[PDB]
Design an enzyme around this catalytic site. Structure first.
Site, PDB file in Angstrom:
ATOM      1  N   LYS A 222      40.549  41.582  28.518  1.00 31.87           N
ATOM      2  CA  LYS A 222      41.007  41.172  29.842  1.00 31.87           C
ATOM      3  C   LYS A 222      41.883  39.939  29.680  1.00 31.87           C
ATOM      4  O   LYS A 222      41.393  38.857  29.347  1.00 31.87           O
ATOM      5  CB  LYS A 222      39.837  40.887  30.782  1.00 31.87           C
ATOM      6  N   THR A 283      43.118  44.653  38.707  1.00 28.46           N
ATOM      7  CA  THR A 283      42.678  44.058  39.964  1.00 28.46           C
ATOM      8  C   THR A 283      42.602  45.130  41.034  1.00 28.46           C
ATOM      9  O   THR A 283      41.985  46.192  40.835  1.00 28.46           O
ATOM     10  CB  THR A 283      43.570  42.935  40.493  1.00 28.46           C
TER      11      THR A 283
END
Ligand SMILES: [Mg+2]
Lengths: 479, 478
Positions: A222, A283
Site C-alpha cells: 500500500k 480507495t
C-alpha cells in the site's frame, strides 16, 4: 466472441455484502477479487466470509481471489463524549496521548498513536479527516501537543491524522497486524496487503511473518506515504519488495498535495508495469454510490483515466462493504471500464523498445504480445502456465485482446484474477505439446470465446527436460 | 513565479452579484466570465458586463466576456405538484398540450412540441440526466405513451434527452435571436451556440450576430450525438467554430458517460489540430456548490482535462449560485498548477509530418520549437495585434508562458481564453527590434522576466502594408 472487460474490480466485504444475497450479486456483476479489511470485524467474520466466497465461486464457476488488507497503525484522534464542534479561527486545540473519551469541543482529545509527540515539531501541520480539519502545532510538552486551528469544521470520533509531508515514525506492523497475518494465513488469502510501509524492509518483515505462519501469499504494498514517492529510489525500493502495488489515494493525497497525486498515480502504475508487477488503483473510486444508484460524472472520468493510465484493477471499499448498492456499483464500474478500454491509447504498445530481456519466459511473453497485436485475425492470446507467470508478463503489455490463462491450480486461477486482461480458465488435460494446445483452444471455443476462423497466439513450455519453463509460441487456427 | 496556463471560465449569477463576489472570483484568477442566457433578463447581463469591465480596469486584468445562448428547451414543462414517482412497469405520457397539470397519473407537457414525431416505439427518453428514464410504447397525434423502467423524483422543468441522437429541434430559438442582439449590445468576446447539428447552424448564428454588428468569436457547444458520430461530423462543427466547448452534461447522457471520456479527448485534440481553442465545460467541481473542498474525483477530472490539453475549464453553479465562488476558483487554479508540472503536458512533437502554407503559422511553430529546445528560455512573446500568433503558439504544449502583446482591448480580452497566454497592453510607435526590446523590458519591469533570461519574440517586420507576423527573435533580457 463478445468484448471482455480487461480491467479488474476489487470489492471490499462487510455488512452490505453479508446482508441478503449481496455477496453473490457482487460476484455475478463481475468482481474478480474480494477484499477482507482487517480494520473491522473479527477473525470469525473474515473466515465465514471466506467460506461463503469460495462456495459462491464454486457454484457460479467463477475464479475469485481473496485479498487480505491489514489495518496498520491507527493514527486517529480516538473518541469524545459526542460533542463534535470545532470552529474556524485560531482556537487552541490539544492532542494528549494520555486521555480517554473526554469530549473534544474545547482543546482536548486523546491520540491512539502515542508516538505523535516525538514526531511533530512546532510549525508542523496535521490534517484531520483528509483535511476537512487542519491544525498547526504550537508546542509539544510531554505527551501533550498544543495546536491552533487554521482551517476548521466538524470533528467526529476516531477520524484520522496525517502529517503534511512525510514524518511520522509509527511502525507499519502493529501487534494487531501480526495477529491478523496469522488469520490471513489460516484463511489462505491469495494476496496480503501491508499498510503504511516505510521501505521495502517493512514488506519483507510482513512477508516473513506470513511465511512463518505457512502462507506464501503475494504481497501488496500500500503506497500511502509521502516517504514512498519522494524519489525514484524510494519508489523502486517499495515496488521491488512487492508482488502488487496498491495506489491508495486517500492518505497519500492528504500528505503530499491532492494535485500532486495525479502525477504520482500515473507514475506508480507505469513503474509497476515496468517492473513486471500488477497494480491496483484504490480507495473509494465511486464514492457517491454509497448513497445514490448512479455515479458522479467526475467519478466516471476518474475510473476511466485510471484504466487509461494502465491499472490492472480498481477497488470499491464502502460502496460494497457498507453501501446501498453493492452489485449496482460493481455493474456501473464494469461499464465504465468497458467504455474506457475502447479508447485507442490503451490498446497499443511500443512493446518495450530499448528493453533487453534476460529471461526466456519473458521473451516468449513479449514476442507473443508483439505477434498478437500486429497479426490480422488474432482474437486471443492463450497462456498455458501453471504458475500464472506468463499471464503476468503478457498482461504487462497494452492490448485490446483477451489473455486466457490456463492452469489446473485454483491458486493460480485465483491469482490471475487480478491481472489486466486475463481470464482464468481451468484446464487439466494430461496432454502436453500441440495436443494440449489444441485441446485448450477447443475448450475456449466450446465456451464462446473463440470462433471457427480465428487466429490465436499460444504460449507453452515444451522441452524434453525437467529444466526450464515457458519457451514456445504457437500461432494456431481454431477448429 | 511559475504561472498558471489553463484558463478558468466562471459563470455569473446571484452568487456573484451578492456581496463583492464578482471581484473576488476575478482576483482569484477567472480569465473569462460567462453570461448564461438561460437565466436572467437582458438588463442583468448588461449590468454585470459593466461591473466586470469596471473590476478589470481597476485590477489591471484582462477578462474576456462569453455569452452562452440557451438553445431549445427540451424539458418537461411543469405540473401542480408531483415531484415523486415509482416505477417497475408504470405508464407515463408526454402530451404537448399542457401548462401546469399534474405529473403523477402519467401526464406532463413538453415545451418542445416536436418530440412526438422524433420518438418511435422502443426509444428511451432520459429525464433529469437519466435519473429518470422512459421507454416509448406508442405515439398517436401529439401524445406519446411510454413505460418508466428507471425512475425516481421528477421535479420542475427537468431536461429530456433521447438515448443516442434523434431529436430534431431547431438550434437557434427566437429567444436565442433576441439574446444574440443583447450579446451584440454588450459586445461579448465569445458567443456560444447551443445544440448545433452541423456547421450550418453555427453559420446561421454568426450571421445573426453579424447583422447585429457583432463579430464575436463563435463557440460551438458540442452537446449532441450527431456532432461526434464521425470524424466528418466533428470537423464540420469545429471548422465552423472559433472555440469548441465539450458540453459534458447533455452529450454524456446521450452517448453514455463511458464514451464521453474518449469523445472529450478526441474533441480537444482535434480542436487543437485545427488551430481552435477548446473549453471543457460544466460542473467541474460540483461538490463546491455546497462544500468548501472539492471531491478527489473532481480534482482528478479537472487535472486530466489539463493533461488532455484543454485551453480552459469551466465553472457553472459553483460561481453563479453557490456558497464558495471565489474559493472554488482558487481550488480550480491550484489543481491546474499542480497538473501542469506533469512532463506529459509540457512536451511536444511540434507537428511532425504537418506542412504549413501560412508564414505566420510557420513562424509560430518554429518559435515554439526553439522555445522548447533552447536552454535558458523563459518566455515566448507574441507581438500580435489580432492575437493570431498567440492562438497558434499556444496550440503547442509547453511549460513556458506566452505573453501576447497587443494595443487593442479586444485582442487582449480575446487572448485571455488561450492556454498559457498572458495578455499585456503594448503600444510603441517604434518598430522592429526597437519595439521588440521595448516589449521585453516592459515584461521585465512588470516582474515577468529576469535580466539573465532568454526570450522568443514573434512579430511582423516588413517595409510593406502587405502581410503579418513573419519574424522570430531570440533576445537576452537587460
Ligand atoms: Mg495463504
Amino acid at each position: 466472441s463478445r468484448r471482455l472487460r480487461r480491467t479488474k474490480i476489487v470489492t471490499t466485504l462487510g455488512p452490505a455484502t453479508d446482508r441478503d444475497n449481496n455477496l453473490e450479486k457482487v460476484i455475478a456483476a463481475g468482481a474478480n477479487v474480494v477484499r477482507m479489511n482487517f480494520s473491522h470485524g473479527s477473525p470469525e467474520d473474515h473466515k465465514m466470509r471466506a467460506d461463503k466466497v469460495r462456495e459462491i465461486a464454486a457454484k457460479l464457476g467463477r475464479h475469485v481471489a481473496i485479498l487480505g488488507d491489514l489495518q496498520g497503525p491507527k493514527i486517529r484522534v480516538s473518541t469524545f463524549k459526542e460533542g463534535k464542534v470545532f470552529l474556524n479561527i485560531g482556537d487552541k486545540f490539544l492532542l494528549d496521548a494520555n486521555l480517554g473519551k473526554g469530549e473534544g469541543d474545547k482543546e482536548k482529545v486523546g491520540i491512539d498513536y502515542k508516538g505523535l509527540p516525538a514526531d511533530v515539531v512546532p510549525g508542523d501541520i496535521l490534517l484531520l479527516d483528509d483535511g476537512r480539519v487542519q491544525l498547526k502545532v504550537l508546542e509539544v510538552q510531554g505527551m501533550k501537543v498544543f495546536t491552533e486551528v487554521t482551517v476548521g469544521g466538524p470533528l467526529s470520533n476516531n477520524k484520522g491524522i496525517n502529517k503534511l509531508g512525510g514524518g511520522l515514525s509509527a511502525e507499519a506492523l502493529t501487534e494487531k497486524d501480526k495477529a491478523d497475518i496469522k488469520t490471513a494465513a489460516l484463511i489462505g488469502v491469495d494476496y496480503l496487503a501491508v499498510s503504511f510501509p516505510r521501505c521495502g524492509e517493512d514488506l519483507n518483515y510482513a512477508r516473513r511473518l506470513a511465511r512463518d505462519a505457512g502462507c506464501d501469499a503475494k504481497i501488496v504494498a500500500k503506497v500511502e506515504r509521502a516517504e514512498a514517492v519522494c524519489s525514484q529510489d524510494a519508489m523502486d525500493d517499495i515496488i521491488l519488495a512487492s508482488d502488487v502495488v496498491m495506489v491508495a489515494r486517500g492518505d497519500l493525497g492528504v500528505e503530499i498535495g491532492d494535485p500532486e497525486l495525479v502525477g504520482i498515480q500515473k507514475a506508480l502504475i507505469r513503474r509497476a508495469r515496468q517492473l513486471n508487477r500488477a497494480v491496483i488503483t484504490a480507495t473509494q473510486m465511486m464514492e457517491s454510490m454509497i448513497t445514490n444508484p448512479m455515479p458522479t460524472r467526475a467519478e466516471v472520468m476518474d475510473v476511466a483515466n485510471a484504466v487509461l493510465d494502465g491499472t490492472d484493477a480498481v477497488m470499491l471499499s464502502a460502496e460494497t462493504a457498507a453501501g446501498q448498492y453493492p452489485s449496482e456499483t460493481v455493474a456501473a464500474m464494469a461499464r465504465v471500464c468497458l467504455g474506457a478500454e475502447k479508447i485507442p491509447s490503451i490498446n497499443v504498445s511500443k512493446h518495450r523498445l530499448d528493453v533487453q530481456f534476460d529471461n526466456v519466459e519473458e521473451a516468449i511473453a513479449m514476442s507473443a504480445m508483439y505477434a498478437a497485436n500486429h497479426l490480422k485475425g488474432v482474437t486471443a492470446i492463450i497462456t498455458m502456465t501453471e504458475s500464472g507467470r506468463t499471464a503476468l508478463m503478457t498482461s504487462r503489455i497494452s492490448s485490446g485482446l483477451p489473455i486466457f490463462a490456463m492452469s489446473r491450480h485454483e491458486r493460480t486461477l485465483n491469482l490471475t484474477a487480478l491481472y489486466r486482461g486475463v481470464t482464468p480458465v481451468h484446464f487439466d488435460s494430461a496432454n502436453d505439446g500441440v495436443a494440449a494446445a489444441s485441446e485448450a483452444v477447443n475448450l475456449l471455443r466450446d465456451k464462446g470465446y473463440l470462433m471457427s476462423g480465428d487466429l490465436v497466439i499460444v504460449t507453452q513450455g515444451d522441452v524434453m527436460s525437467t529444466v526450464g519453463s515457458t519457451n514456445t509460441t504457437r500461432i494456431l487456427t481454431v477448429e
